[PDB]
Structure formats: structure tokens, C-alpha cells
Ligand binder design. Structure first.
Ligand code: SF4
Length: 753
């Protein structure tokens, strides 16, 4: 048909809208009903469209994704697992992005230089693994992974998977972009089918047009407060309505991005003119042109059934600000100054932070700049500390050139390197002592306890870049930009005008410096050296196969109460240093969870010694002595980041099973991949029958089966037994992973030995 290539860097890899079409057609013949946009792209990508059983919320689809993307903090373990497979070359276009390890301290060029020195060992291992398996590499300084994908790799109709939970960002350009763990991405780099449980679809209908201070971030801050952190679990969010055309392509990216915060498999928009415009301005005008010929399969079918519909009138929507320690606690900016005051949240703002993959684009930077020049016109500068992260080299080079970066500098801001930085806690914050209670306002997405500075008493509120700017100028949460009056230098009271700004540069985008490094697809005659005495990298040893027996007299390591995020299970910040060393990173296991016995973080009873101590050391002690253990958690366990370390670490320290009232998706998949047993209570009130002193026997593992529950004998210390039933979402493919000890031990048996 046409030969239009997937990117400027793979000129030989072509977009298959013909294959999409062929399979959407086979599927709609079988179903005879309207398909939504997400069903078309997803079902369009099935390995077997004539035979696949499709039932939303029930069947597991075996899919063929178009590309794989990884960032430096999760690419390490994903590549160390690819090296154990023993396969020579990745089978689909794959990329590594070096965005997570650049700590913020001094600002821009300085922080990058110091990071290239400190992280040389790791960046070197990724560059060599890259050259060898044929994975493209974006060097430190290039930008935050999702801004680089939308600028170079995302198009209408792509199915892209990535080792980072905010990969949905790509829905701003009409693809199905989905967050996964390192072992899922190894399957796809290895060329085997990827499985996804078939999603429900929540249609959200946008009406009106946004006006003034309201921006794209307010739509997803309000959707989050309406649907809550677990309302999107098992669903794709599918936007539609007349209001869509009012939103920029990067603002659509913004909204798809933070759908991660309601547990959604991903979010997506239909191909329209704002997207076409952006493809053309990022040199992919031929992809805009080919999407016009395929437009019917890149929009939803007339009258498709959504499993839930929600409607938002953009024109009625006001400025929002969410948190303190969950992103679905939504307030209007006009009332946050009084709830905080009622609730005891601190009112003076210490630091205001714009950036992250949710809000770091050319439009975000210019809208922020426009509040800042008004303050400058009255001789005012930031009363809070103000830091600014650009999303990529191209945005850094271009806002510099269009004058924005200098306006933001003149009000008192520091421009950091194009990296995550403060958002995964790679910040060297020294204005507060730890445990000092304070307020930081960000334009980020998560605001879980201790995540930006490892201080639990930091109250972080997430919002939009123009509201962060306005409030940093004011220095207080009691300030509504829309109503209130600042006082200039001159003695005159003035009020801020709502910001106006271009969505893309009028001129072309200045590209900045070279940051991409292509694989030699020639040479690749590299050796990947991992020093055997290294502290940051260590090769893997397989896990144990299942011994054919049931799990008797298991010890409860911890029974967790409340919210247990993957930032509570495996902390980030200073622990990023060890993302390539399983034994050294296993020392943060569960140190942030609250134990129900004492309401304390990292303080659990050792069953043997009866002394209370750290969770890592207690699990190593149990392991050392042959005690197999279990974790009992509450609802929506594993909320957050997709880091597979949160499942690798309990397996490394002797953990056998995890039993919760519900799981967040990616974490449940990550636990089955590593040989553990994620199990749910068939009755959630059974959580109250189990006490940390009891021993549990999981029985009937020998005739393990999809749909059939397993029985748990809660042995109470007094001799009382009790049976409860525990359900599991395993299909027979997954049961082969557990029997073998892990998906990777299974993939290695199938290589005929
Ligand atoms: S949420 Fe923060 S840490 Fe995660 S990719 Fe976005 S910017 Fe980096």
C-alpha cells in the first residue's frame, strides 16, 4: 500500500494501517455491533483475530505491539532479564531514555555534567546493551521519555508498551499506549504474544470549550476526584464530544497521562485536526496524510457502547488543585485556602515546581511565562522558590529562543535539566529539616507520602503550570488568581490577567543538540561488562521451580493497613542507584507500609526473637532460617508506578504469596511474572479474621485452575482452624509461570532444554 515509516530513525519500519483494517474487519464480522476507538486499535492488533474470544473484563487478549520504550531506571532490570533469555536481537523497534537519574541541585548544565560523571557505570551498561541487542538510545539530557515519544514515536493507531506507568501520555496522538513491567517488555522484545485482559471502556463526553484560567489539567483533576484512584481499574478511558476540538494536542496528552492516577489500562482521543497540526510541525506530515486516508478506523464507530459514560462541560469548569497525599482529593483553587486552614495543612508555599511528563510542553511553558511577565511589569518576583523543568531538548532550545526561559528566570526561577528530577525525588532539597511540615505545590501527577524529598510531612498539591506560577508569586494557598489582588512595587493594587499563549511555536521547533544514538546494525560485537564486585549492577540467578507441594505454615511478614502504593513497597529517590542490583535494592522492601499492629512504618515483630525491627532485615532473617512468608494487604494494593522491583524484591527475600482485598493491575501482573501468588479474598471481610500471629496454609495448588478458588487454612495460635476461599485471575499460560518459578524460567524451558 504506501511505505510511510514509523519514525525519522527507523526509515525501513512501516506503518501497517492495512493490517489494522484487515483485522478490525475480521473482528466486526464476528461481533456485529459498533466498536469503540480503543476496541478498534486493540482488536486491530490481535495475534489471532479469527479465533480470539473477546469478552470485555473477562478474556485475555494475545496482542502484537508495534514498539517497546524504556527509561534508564527500569531499563536496567529489563535488560538484565533480556540477557538471561540468551536471545541475540530485539524483535520490534525498542528505545532507552535516560531521564530518571539526573539529580537536581545546581540547575541545568551543571546538574547534567555531575550526573554524567556519577552515573557513568549505568549509562555505559545501557549504551552497550543498546548497541548489542539493537535498541536505540537517547542520552542524558535528551528529555523525559513521554515528551520524546510524543515528539518522535507516537502516531494514530499505534499500540506501544513502555516500562513506566505514565506511557498513556501517547493517547494525546491517538495510539493505545500502555504501561507494563520489565518482564512483559522482554516477552515482546523476544517476539512472543503479549497478553492483556480485555478492557471495559468508560466514555467521557466533553462539551463546551475551556476559557481563561481553566486548562487541560483541570479536566483530569476533576475526572480523578469524580472516579477516584480505583475507579478506572480494568478500563480504557475514551474521550469524545464537541469539546475535544477545543483542546491542544499536548493538552490531550496531559489528560491521557494522569488517567494513570485512576488505575486505567490507558486513555485515548480520536484523530482530529489538532493532532494533524502537531504531526506536521514535528516533521511527520506524511503520517498525518496517511492517517487522513485511514481516518475511519482512527475514530469510534457511530453509536458504540461505553460501559460507563461521564459528561463534563468545559465552559463551566473552574481551576482545580488536588491532594495533600492522594491525587483524587480534588478542591477548587478558589476554596483550597479555606479547607487547608480548616484541615491544618500549612498555608505558606515553600517551593513551586512546574514540569514532569504531565506538564512540561511548549504551551505549558508559555502559559506560565505569561503570568510571570505580568508580575515583572509591576516589579514583583516569586515569593516562593520556583523551579522549571523542560520536557525535552527541543522544548528547552525553543522556549529559550522564543524568550520564555528568560521571563521565568527574571521572576526568580531555576531552570533544571530535561529530566524527571524532583518528581521521582531526585532533588537535593535543603530548605526544610526532615519531619518539618511544609507545603510544596507542583504541576506533577502523584503526591504520595515522601515521594519528592523523602520527607513524610511535605504536603504536596498537584495543579496546572499557570496556577503554580501565580501561587509562587503570591507565596500562599490563600490566593485565588481569578479574584485577588497583588500589590506592585509602585503602591498600586493589580489583578492577574488569565494567561494566553501559542500551542506550538510559530516558527519551527529548534531541535537543540544531538542526543540520539542509533544501534550499529552492523558491529554489535560488544561485550557487556558487569563488574562482579559492583554495587549498582549484578547479574541474575533464576528462581526456584515449584516443588509440587502446597504452602503450609506460612508466616505473615506484615499485614498492611490502608494505602500501599509501589512507592510504599519499593521507594524511589536515593534507592534509584540500585535499580540494577536486586540484593542491594531489596533493602527498601515495604519500609513505607503501615503495620496494623502498631500503626508504624518499618517496625514489625520478628516471630522468633520477639523483638520489633525493620521489614527488610526481618524477611532476610526469615529467609536465612527457612521461614516462607506472606503479605496481607488492603484495597488497591500496588497502586502507582509500574516498577517490577516491587515484585522482584519479595521473591528475592523469601516471600511466597500476597493476599489483598483488591490489586492494581500492573502490580498483579508483575507478581505473577516473578513466580508469586497474588490472591484476593472471596469475601473482603475475611481480612478481619487474620491476625499477624497466625499461620496460613494455601491448599489445592496441585490442581490449580482458572476460575477454581484455592482454600486457606488460617491456623490460630490456640489450635482453632478456619478455612476461607481465595480467588485468583490466572489463566493456564500464567499457571505455567508459577509452576516454573517465573515467566523467564518458562521461556527458557521452551528453548528445547
Ligand atoms: S511521573 Fe515524574 S518520575 Fe514518572 S516519568 Fe513523569 S516526570 Fe519522570
Amino acid at each position: 500500500r504506501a511505505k510511510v515509516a514509523m519514525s525519522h530513525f527507523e526509515p525501513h519500519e512501516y506503518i501497517r494501517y492495512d493490517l489494522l483494517e484487515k483485522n478490525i474487519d475480521i473482528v466486526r464480522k464476528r461481533l456485529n455491533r459498533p466498536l469503540t476507538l480503543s476496541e478498534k486499535i486493540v482488536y486491530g492488533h490481535l495475534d489471532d483475530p479469527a479465533n480470539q474470544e473477546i469478552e470485555r473484563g473477562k478474556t485475555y487478549l494475545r496482542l502484537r505491539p508495534d514498539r517497546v520504550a524504556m527509561q534508564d531506571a527500569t531499563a536496567q532490570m529489563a535488560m538484565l532479564q533480556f540477557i538471561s533469555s540468551g536471545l541475540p536481537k530485539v524483535a520490534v523497534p525498542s528505545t532507552i531514555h535516560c531521564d530518571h537519574l539526573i539529580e537536581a541541585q545546581l540547575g541545568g548544565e551543571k546538574d547534567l555534567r555531575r550526573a554524567k560523571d556519577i552515573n557513568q557505570e549505568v549509562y555505559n551498561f545501557l549504551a552497550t546493551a543498546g548497541a548489542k541487542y539493537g535498541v536505540g538510545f537517547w542520552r542524558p539530557g535528551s528529555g523525559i521519555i513521554h515528551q520524546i515519544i510524543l515528539e518522535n514515536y507516537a502516531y494514530p493507531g499505534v499500540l506501544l508498551i513502555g516500562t513506566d506507568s505514565h506511557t498513556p501520555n501517547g493517547g494525546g496522538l491517538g495510539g493505545i499506549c500502555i504501561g507494563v513491567g520489565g518482564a512483559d517488555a522482554v516477552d515482546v522484545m523476544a517476539g512472543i504474544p503479549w497478553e492483556l485482559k480485555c478492557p471495559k471502556v468508560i466514555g467521557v463526553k466533553l462539551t463546551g470549550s475551556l476559557s481563561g484560567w481553566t486548562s487541560p489539567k483541570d479536566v483530569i483533576l476533576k475526572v480523578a476526584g469524580i472516579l477516584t484512584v480505583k475507579g478506572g481499574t480494568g478500563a480504557i478511558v475514551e474521550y469524545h464530544g464537541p469539546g475535544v476540538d477545543s483542546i491542544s494536542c499536548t493538552g490531550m496528552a496531559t489528560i491521557c497521562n494522569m488517567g494513570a492516577e485512576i488505575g486505567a489500562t490507558t486513555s485515548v482521543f480520536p484523530y482530529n485536526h489538532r493532532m494533524k497540526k502537531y504531526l506536521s510541525k514535528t516533521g511527520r506530515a506524511d503520517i498525518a496524510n496517511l492517517a487522513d486516508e485511514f481516518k475511519d478506523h482512527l475514530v469510534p464507530d457511530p453509536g458504540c457502547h461505553y460501559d460507563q459514560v461521564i459528561e463534563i462541560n468545559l465552559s463551566e469548569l473552574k481551576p482545580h488543585i488536588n491532594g495533600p497525599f492522594t491525587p483524587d482529593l480534588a478542591h477548587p483553587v478558589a476554596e483550597v485556602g479555606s479547607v487547608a486552614e480548616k484541615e491544618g495543612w500549612p498555608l505558606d508555599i515553600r517551593v513551586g515546581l512546574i514540569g514532569s511528563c504531565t506538564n512540561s510542553s511548549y504551551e505549558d511553558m508559555g502559559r506560565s511565562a505569561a503570568v510571570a511577565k505580568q508580575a515583572l511589569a509591576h516589579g514583583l518576583k516569586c515569593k516562593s522558590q520556583f523551579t522549571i523543568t523542560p520536557g525535552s531538548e527541543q522544548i528547552r532550545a525553543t522556549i529559550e529562543r522564543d524568550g520564555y526561559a528568560q521571563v521565568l528566570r527574571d521572576v526568580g526561577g531555576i531552570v533544571l535539566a530535561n529530566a524527571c528530577g524532583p518528581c521521582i525525588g531526585q532533588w537535593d532539597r535543603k530548605d526544610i529539616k526532615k519531619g518539618e511540615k511544609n507545603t510544596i505545590v507542583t504541576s506533577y501527577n502523584r503526591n504520595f507520602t515522601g515521594r519528592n524529598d523523602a520527607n513524610p510531612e511535605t504536603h504536596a498539591f498537584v495543579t496546572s503550570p499557570e496556577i503554580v506560577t501565580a501561587l509562587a508569586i503570591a507565596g500562599t494557598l490563600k490566593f485565588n488568581p481569578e479574584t485577588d489582588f497583588l500589590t506592585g512595587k509602585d503602591g498600586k493594587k493589580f489583578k492577574l490577567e488569565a494567561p494566553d499563549a501559542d500551542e506550538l511555536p510559530r516558527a519551527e521547533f529548534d531541535p537543540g543538540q544531538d542526543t540520539y544514538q542509533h544501534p550499529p546494525k552492523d558491529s554489535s560485537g560488544q561485550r557487556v561488562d558487569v563488574s562482579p564486585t559492583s554495587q549498582r549492577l549484578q547479574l541474575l540467578e533464576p528462581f526456584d521451580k515449584w516443588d509440587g507441594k502446597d504452602l503450609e505454615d506460612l508466616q505473615i511478614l506484615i499485614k498492611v493497613k490502608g494505602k500501599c502504593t509501589t512507592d510504599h513497597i519499593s521507594a524511589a529517590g536515593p534507592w534509584l542507584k540500585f535499580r540494577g542490583h536486586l540484593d542491594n535494592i531489596s533493602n527498601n522492601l515495604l519500609i513505607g507500609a503501615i503495620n496494623i499492629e502498631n500503626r508504624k512504618a518499618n517496625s514489625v515483630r520478628n516471630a522468633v526473637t520477639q523483638e520489633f525491627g525493620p521489614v527488610p532485615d526481618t524477611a532476610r532473617y526469615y529467609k536465612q532460617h527457612g521461614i516462607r512468608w506472606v503479605v496481607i494487604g488492603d484495597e488497591n494494593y500496588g497502586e502507582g508506578a509500574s516498577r517490577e522491583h516491587s515484585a522482584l524484591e519479595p521473591r528475592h527475600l523469601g516471600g511466597r504469596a500476597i493476599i489483598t482485598k483488591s490489586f492494581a493491575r500492573i502490580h498483579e501482573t508483575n507478581l505473577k511474572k516473578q513466580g508469586l501468588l497474588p490472591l484476593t479474598f472471596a469475601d473482603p471481610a475475611d481480612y478481619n479474621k487474620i491476625h499477624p500471629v497466625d499461620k496460613l496454609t494455601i491448599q489445592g495448588l496441585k490442581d490449580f485452575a482458572p476460575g477454581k478458588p484455592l482454600k486457606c487454612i488460617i491456623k490460630h495460635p490456640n489450635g482453632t482452624q478456619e478455612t476461607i476461599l481465595l480467588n485468583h485471575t490466572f489463566n493456564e499460560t500464567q499457571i505455567e509461570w508459577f509452576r516454573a518459578g517465573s515467566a523467564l524460567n518458562r521461556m527458557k524451558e521452551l528453548q528445547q532444554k
